[PDB]
Amino acid sequence: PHEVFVELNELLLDKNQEPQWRETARWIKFEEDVEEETERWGKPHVASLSFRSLLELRRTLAHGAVLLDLDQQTLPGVAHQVVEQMVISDQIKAEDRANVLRALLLKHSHPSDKSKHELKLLEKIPENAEATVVLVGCVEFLSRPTMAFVRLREAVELDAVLEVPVPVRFLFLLLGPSSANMDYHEIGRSISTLMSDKQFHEAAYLADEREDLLTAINAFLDCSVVLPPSEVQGEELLRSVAHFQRQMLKKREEQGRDPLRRTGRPFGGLIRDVRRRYPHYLSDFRDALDPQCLAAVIFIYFAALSPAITFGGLLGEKTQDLIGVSELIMSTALQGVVFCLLGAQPLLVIGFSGPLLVFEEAFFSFCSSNHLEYLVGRVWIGFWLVFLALLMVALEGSFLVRFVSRFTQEIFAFLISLIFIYETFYKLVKIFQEHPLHGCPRGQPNTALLSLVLMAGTFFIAFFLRKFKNSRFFPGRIRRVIGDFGVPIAILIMVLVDYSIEDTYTQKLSVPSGFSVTAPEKRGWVINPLGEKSPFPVWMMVASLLPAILVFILIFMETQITTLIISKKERMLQKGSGFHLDLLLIVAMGGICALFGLPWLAAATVRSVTHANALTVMSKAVAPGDKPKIQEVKEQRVTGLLVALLVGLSIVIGDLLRQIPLAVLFGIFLYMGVTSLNGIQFYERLHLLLMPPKHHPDVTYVKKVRTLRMHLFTALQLLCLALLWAVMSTAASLAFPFILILTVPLRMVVLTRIFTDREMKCLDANEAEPVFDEREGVDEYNEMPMPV
Amino acid sequence: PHEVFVELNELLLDKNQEPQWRETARWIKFEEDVEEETERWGKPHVASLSFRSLLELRRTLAHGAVLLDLDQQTLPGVAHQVVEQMVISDQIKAEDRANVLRALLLKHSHPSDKSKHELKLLEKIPENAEATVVLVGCVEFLSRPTMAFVRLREAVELDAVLEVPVPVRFLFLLLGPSSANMDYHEIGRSISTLMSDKQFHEAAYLADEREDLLTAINAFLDCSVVLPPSEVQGEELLRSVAHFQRQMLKKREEQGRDPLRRTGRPFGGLIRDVRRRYPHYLSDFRDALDPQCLAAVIFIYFAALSPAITFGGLLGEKTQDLIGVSELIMSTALQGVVFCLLGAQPLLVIGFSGPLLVFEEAFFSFCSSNHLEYLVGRVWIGFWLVFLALLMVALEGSFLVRFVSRFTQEIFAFLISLIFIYETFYKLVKIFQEHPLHGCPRGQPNTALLSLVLMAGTFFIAFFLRKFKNSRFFPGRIRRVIGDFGVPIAILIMVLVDYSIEDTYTQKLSVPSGFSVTAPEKRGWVINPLGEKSPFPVWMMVASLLPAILVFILIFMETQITTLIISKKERMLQKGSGFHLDLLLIVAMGGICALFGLPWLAAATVRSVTHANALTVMSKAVAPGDKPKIQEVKEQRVTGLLVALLVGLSIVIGDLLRQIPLAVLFGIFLYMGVTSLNGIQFYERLHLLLMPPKHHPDVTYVKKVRTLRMHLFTALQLLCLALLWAVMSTAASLAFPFILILTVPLRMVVLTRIFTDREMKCLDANEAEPVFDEREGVDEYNEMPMPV
Numbered sequence A, B: 001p002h003e004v005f006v007e008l009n010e011l012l013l014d015k016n017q018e019p020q021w022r023e024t025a026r027w028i029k030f031e032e033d034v035e036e037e038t039e040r041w042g043k044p045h046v047a048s049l050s051f052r053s054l055l056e057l058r059r060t061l062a063h064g065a066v067l068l069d070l071d072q073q074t075l076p077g078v079a080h081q082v083v084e085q086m087v088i089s090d091q092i093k094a095e096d097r098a099n100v101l102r103a104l105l106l107k108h109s110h111p112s113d114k115s116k117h118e119l120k121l122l123e124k125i126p127e128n129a130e131a132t133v134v135l136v137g138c139v140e141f142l143s144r145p146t147m148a149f150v151r152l153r154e155a156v157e158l159d160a161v162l163e164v165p166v167p168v169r170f171l172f173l174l175l176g177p178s179s180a181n182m183d184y185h186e187i188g189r190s191i192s193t194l195m196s197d198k199q200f201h202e203a204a205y206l207a208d209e210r211e212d213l214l215t216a217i218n219a220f221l222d223c224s225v226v227l228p229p230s231e232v233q234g235e236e237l238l239r240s241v242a243h244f245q246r247q248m249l250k251k252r253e254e255q256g257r258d259p260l261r262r263t264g265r266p267f268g269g270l271i272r273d274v275r276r277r278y279p280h281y282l283s284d285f286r287d288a289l290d291p292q293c294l295a296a297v298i299f300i301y302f303a304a305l306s307p308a309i310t311f312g313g314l315l316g317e318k319t320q321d322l323i324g325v326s327e328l329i330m331s332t333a334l335q336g337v338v339f340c341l342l343g344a345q346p347l348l349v350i351g352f353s354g355p356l357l358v359f360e361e362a363f364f365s366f367c368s369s370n371h372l373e374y375l376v377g378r379v380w381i382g383f384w385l386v387f388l389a390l391l392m393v394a395l396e397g398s399f400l401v402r403f404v405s406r407f408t409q410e411i412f413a414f415l416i417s418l419i420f421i422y423e424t425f426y427k428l429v430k431i432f433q434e435h436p437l438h439g440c441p442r443g444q445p446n447t448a449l450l451s452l453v454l455m456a457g458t459f460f461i462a463f464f465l466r467k468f469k470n471s472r473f474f475p476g477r478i479r480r481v482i483g484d485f486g487v488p489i490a491i492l493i494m495v496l497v498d499y500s501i502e503d504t505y506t507q508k509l510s511v512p513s514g515f516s517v518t519a520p521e522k523r524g525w526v527i528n529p530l531g532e533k534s535p536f537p538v539w540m541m542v543a544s545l546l547p548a549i550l551v552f553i554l555i556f557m558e559t560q561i562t563t564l565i566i567s568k569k570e571r572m573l574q575k576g577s578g579f580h581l582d583l584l585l586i587v588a589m590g591g592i593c594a595l596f597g598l599p600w601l602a603a604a605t606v607r608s609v610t611h612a613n614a615l616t617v618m619s620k621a622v623a624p625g626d627k628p629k630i631q632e633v634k635e636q637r638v639t640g641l642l643v644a645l646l647v648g649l650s651i652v653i654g655d656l657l658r659q660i661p662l663a664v665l666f667g668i669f670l671y672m673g674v675t676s677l678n679g680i681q682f683y684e685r686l687h688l689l690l691m692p693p694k695h696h697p698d699v700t701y702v703k704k705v706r707t708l709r710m711h712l713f714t715a716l717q718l719l720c721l722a723l724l725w726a727v728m729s730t731a732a733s734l735a736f737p738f739i740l741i742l743t744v745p746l747r748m749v750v751l752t753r754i755f756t757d758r759e760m761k762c763l764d765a766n767e768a769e770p771v772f773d774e775r776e777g778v779d780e781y782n783e784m785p786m787p788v
């Protein structure tokens, strides 16, 4: 029951008319061929063998000779008995035992002639494999085609017939005249393909007579897919063959033969998730003495720093510099270090996200209308956030995440992706109104156009760099560690270009001097929970619970959707998850930090996935032509600590971060908003609405359902999204999480009556397939339908 | 020997337990299947049938019933004789003769209900094509599978068994118990696949016994491709299956068994070419009473007007407005009408090209350093151009274009594409030089940035519109009628945007009032050949012959390559073309027209291709899943006349063409320069220089030759091109056609010394395949490896 490595040699004349047995083909899992003109290995492909060759092979084995359990060690030894019983049993007479043996004892030459190629090829083969050599050639001095099949009792390594030092178990030799109308190369290919299949060598092991070999051939024949003699003209061999083979194999085989579990005990989830990860604590600070962690932490720093200033500049601009970029950087370091040192899932990198920014900008306007302080409302919301977190954990309410399906996960992403574009365009339109474009700090000549030029330049540089990265010019291993390295290059290029111009004016960032708040005139370091400049109304210390529920829903969804995808069965995450502990450590820490005037934090979905797949290592011992598979993921909690410490220390360069114009940030904002739309199964279903049915794709949600019903589903999704967007534009904009949570009952009740269970299974398919920066045009953005 | 259309019915129970023989599959050339859940036709695919079904079919054909040469015209009668010979031939014993007859005379239900679907289907089916039906079913009261095969003596329609009104010749029916472990649907598919092959029905027509049918099956089996029972990954089939199929077919087939010619008569080319096109003169003006021509005229007018102003603007700008856009517009119409009235190939759209502009630019600087006059030099060059034209045709030599291969046909295009980009970037640098970007005609504030914005916007709009046009959102018939329709929209958008902003200054086109020269202060309407202001030197009377030779080489190459490519064999261009009446007409007209201070004209190869493939109509009677083929090309000489007349009359819109900013023209210039690089074989070979060999494509010039050899070929091309670029930048810039005519012998001599005859058949591949706006990302720019 071993693995078989097959090699097909041939007897072809050299440049100096030397017989010189030469290697022709090599089978491990799929066939590889050698071209005569370029003498290099080709790409692997499925071995498509003819039928007359199979018929000829079955016919000629009737008169062949078999040597089962042969006790020799060397090729000269085995050849003597082979030719002896060859002559004994009819084929080739006694007047030929001088030249047939001459052909067997010859020199074998390979094209790639402790080395490099040999070591690589041996690595490709499984560790414990047996080898087989098939020798076919045309000989002029024979009469009829003769065959000999042998099986050595003990696996013995030969001298030079093979390509790598692997012992042989079978040897198949075929010699015959060229007068007979037979293709010997095709017969050799057919017998190699037969020997390279499981059910044939598994019977050759147990074979003891020609009858067993004939039965094995017959049983192999009645499992194949015969193609007609019709010329193929393109993609015809993609609809039938694969699905037909899979269906036939399934039919032949069929007829042939929980962390999210309620326990009824208060605070049981915390105990269950702390009794697993913490025992393996010393294994988290010692399994990171490898170069891959050092390589990763360099590029994770940029990926964690770029959103820190992009989301901080807008927050500082909108809130009149009440919460600027300094607080966002300082808040990430304090919570990140605590989460890395004390958390259960250290692969999560926490940071400010999109929906939190939208909620903050919606809440800021609500306080301004009612003439209330903004910092104290946040701290009073923060206190109620801890109570809900403790209540939810004690009752083990984290199992509700199973009820959030793909129907809700994409409307949210589409909304958050439209918000960014609207914000960017509105900001541009406003800049074009502050400074009119008339002739010869308002009323400046070249501020209206310079901002547009910078925004377009940074957006297009980032877009084209992203397009270039996902191409054939980058190897898979270098494409996986590099976590979207286009933004740090576009920002640097635009800053360098803007630095050269020293005559015009443009708005810059608001980084302060030293360790101090961005606006050391309106607030201090601690926020008084009773009132800073005027008493806080007593009636909103109990009425602030309502926004607390909405922000808790947002944080809970954003944190629990990410953790499910990170910890799957396809990814080799072995130690343990943190479903219950992570929520507590993320909601309590943010509620505490809300006192010192710092924003809340979330799971940082895309950054989390990039960090998750930047530490993985892929298997190297895989057969060529097969899809790559994951081997193991390095689990440690020292790279997150280093990233958090570097982000925190990145505040000491405030003399450099002050030179960044406030237009490159909006260009990056628009770029992220545009690129977040990839991977959601709503955008392409909307694209399909503008195509003829003949051009529709071959995805799983078009073949199994009718077109009109799919269009109806898309129309319902559009109606829900439009209703929610219309609600958001009003003065009750502080309610959209409630509408987002009022769409799960709409799917469990209303949407179940219209559609059949089959269409719900086909369309609402929350299954997902992991990506590892393979193929073309697929990156970490395609993994999750959740926005950035 | 006719075509056969077969359909596979299958007895499947209805909703209310009704037998209702139902249609399951339909073969014309490739199989089409009906989906069970959505009951709609799927995409065509190759019929990949199993092997056990074939074996069972061969086994059960041994004791079947063959009603050869039946003489009935109704289904009840043929069913009566079928059941009669079944009960006679020991298939149904004694008690089942009416229940079986009950199943045969039932109602057939097709999944498609003077109509629409069958009118559409009748076109795809060949004209004199016979039809046949195969009926299979899993019934209980048989106790043993029974078969009947018939051949009606005369083709007779059989009411509603078929979905289209086409007579039937055969009908194959199979009934058997479900307790037999036979997949009846698979057997029906297999028998349909055999019946759809030429060598099987061509032997069933003249068969006389079941032995002939068995022999036909056996001969069909020994032509197929057997696939092993191994899972496919999607790409493993493309490498093997098609090539193996082709080689096996070639082996089986083997086992089974000038307009360019000098005569010796002076002016013989004109005599030979007049007697072919002029007899078919009245048909030219009568084969144009079709609705295609209106859309052709309008879209070709839009596609031919844009190059007139784009090339006219730069020529007017950088020649001190000696010749501008008005002269270019008047020159195109004056010669276009003459060529469309007296020409031999009226599909050529003559107009100003790139290389002519480059040569004019180089020549203008040469006359500004020797203190000569630019206009009179041109007219003295023009006189020598006619003499060379008359000498080159009387001594017939319009055959050296066969010696201009693809080696020297791509350096030219890449050179032009680099020249365009360099020109645009130099213009941008200069326009920034005149207007500095400091704070608060020269020195204007907003001219430096507005020009950049206008240049970038139009280029990006055109690029993205071209990318969108070649997607799957557009059908194959609307994509051919419209040419490059992104420029006429980008120009309009960027003119409308600039029109609103009226607070600043920017350079605009210089269009004069009425029919007058663009500079009515330094030149008139007729150029004096002896001198306008100062006497012209006499030593330039004969020293002007060399530039005449150079421009003659340029014009000859540009016209002859286009003439060769258009008049191919794949394109069904009837009547005849002319290689001798075109060159003489074009060169003589240009030489005479240079007297009045107007530029020369060329073939305008991309416009010629767009004109050629906009009048073509593709056949509709083609089997689904096959490559489209050309029915005919409408040949007429009234659309070119209309286009030329419209272009000429477009001069009265001088009050609107004066509002176009000059930066949009440079944006379009850069767009054309960038987009002209598609299709040249040198560019992808340059791309391959920076890619690992494992990711190399499967094109014909990588498999058959080694990597280092193609790298050396590309290095030699780069060396020659760099030498030509270096010599083009000196004070002798008007000598690069000499460099090209020198590098032509270089290919032959050196590359046959070095690279051997085998590789100089795939590296220097002049084959080229026609494009008809099919596939994805392929347009008229890929057809022609020449500049715009």
Ligand SMILES: CC(C)CCC[C@@H](C)[C@H]1CC[C@H]2[C@@H]3CC=C4C[C@@H](OC(=O)CCC(=O)O)CC[C@]4(C)[C@H]3CC[C@]12C
Pocket (backbone or CB within 6 Å): A686, A689, A708, A709, A711, A712, A714, A715, A718
């Ligand atoms: C790209 C976006 C921003 C454009 C605006 C939204 C559309 C995609 C909306 C516009 C009107 C909608 C349509 C209105 C009516 C219908 C009926 C729906 O089917 C039925 O109502 C009954 C048919 C059945 O049940 O099978 C088919 C979808 C469709 C075309 C809807 C699909 C979604 C549409 C096209």
Ligand SMILES: CC(C)CCC[C@H](C)[C@H]1CC[C@H]2[C@@H]3CC=C4C[C@@H](OC(=O)CCC(=O)O)CC[C@]4(C)[C@H]3CC[C@]12C
Pocket (backbone or CB within 6 Å): B689, B708, B709, B711, B712, B715, B718
């Ligand atoms: C726009 C850029 C890409 C221009 C420059 C392209 C590459 C930098 C060029 C520079 C010089 C070139 C090289 C010049 C000489 C050779 C010989 C070629 O070798 C042979 O094939 C000789 C041996 C043989 O007989 O096969 C090896 C490629 C190489 C290094 C060439 C590969 C391409 C190179 C490195």
